[PDB]
Amino acid sequence: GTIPKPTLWAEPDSVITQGSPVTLSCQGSLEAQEYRLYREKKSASWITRIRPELVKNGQFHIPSITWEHTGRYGCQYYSRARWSELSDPLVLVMTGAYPKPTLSAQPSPVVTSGGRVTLQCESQVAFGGFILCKEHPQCLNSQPGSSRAIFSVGPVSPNRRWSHRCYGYDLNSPYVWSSPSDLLELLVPG
Ligand SMILES: [Cl-]
C-alpha cells in the first residue's frame, strides 16, 4: 500500500536574489507525522538532509538565501507507518551574487525577417559560464572561462514579444548566478 506523493513548493519563487527570503514547504497528507527534506548540489553526489531543527512541520523557511541553500530539493513524509516516495524535485537558484553583465544585439535588436541575430553577454570579470533566458523564463547556457559569451537567437516572430536577459555563473556553483542583465527586446519589422 502507498500514501500520496508529497508536493514541494517554493514561495515566492524558485529564483531568489541573494539575501532575500524564500519558504520551501513539503505538503504531506494532513496526518503527516514527520518530514525529511533533502538538497543535492549536483547529480550522483551527496544528498544532504536539511537539519531537522531548520524545518518546522515540513516548512523550511529561509530568511536570507545564501550560496549554501542553492540546489535541487526533494522531500518525503511519514504516515501510516511508512515513508512516502520523494516529491518531484525543486530547483532553488540564487541570483545577484555577482555584478550584472551587459546583453547587446549585433548589428541591432531589429532582426532580419526569417533570420537570426548575434547576442553578446559581456562581463568585466571572467565567468565559468553564461546563461541566456527568454521571458516561467526558459534558460540556456553557453561556455565563454572568459568575460563574454555569444548567443544566436532566431527566427523572431512579428507578433510576439521577444525579451531576454543573461547571467554569468561559475561551474562549481551552477545554481548561483549573477545579477541579471538589463532586458533586451528583439523584434522584426512589420
Ligand atoms: Cl541548510
Quick one: which of 121, 95, 102, 100 has its CA closest to 175?
Answer: 95
Could you check whether 7-95 and 102-186 share the same CATH topology?
Answer: yes
The domain ranges of the chain are 7-95, 102-186
Decide if 178 contacts 97 (C-beta within 8 A): yes
Quick one: which of 83, 121, 91 has its CA closest to 15?
Answer: 91
Resolution (A): 1.7
Decide if 125 contacts 147 (C-beta within 8 A): yes
Q: Is 170 helix (H, G, I), strand (E, B) or coil?
A: coil
Ligand 1 centre from 67 Cα, in Å?
A: 10
Q: What CATH number does domain 7-95 carry, 3.65.10.10, 2.60.40.10, 3.10.129.10, 1.10.10.10? A: 2.60.40.10
* Cα 108 to Cα 119: distance, rounded to the nearest angstrom: 9
> Distance between the two ends of the chain, CA-based, in angstroms?
60
Q: What angle do CA 178, 118, 92 make, to 5 degrees?
A: 25
Which cell numbers in the block locate residue 24? Answer: 520551501
Decide if 116 contacts 109 (C-beta within 8 A): no
Number of CB atoms found within 10 A of residue 145's CB? 15
Approach to solving: X-ray
Quick one: which of 181, 13, 7, 182 has its CA closest to 93?
Answer: 13
Q: Amino acid identity, residue 123?
A: S
Ligand 1 centre from 83 Cα, in Å?
A: 22
Ligand 1 centre from 51 Cα, in Å?
A: 7
Ligand 1 centre from 68 Cα, in Å?
A: 6
Q: Where are the beta strands (DSSP E) in 57-179?
A: 59-62, 71-79, 82-83, 90-95, 102-106, 117-127, 129-134, 138-142, 146-153, 162-169
CATH class of the structural domain 102-186: mainly beta
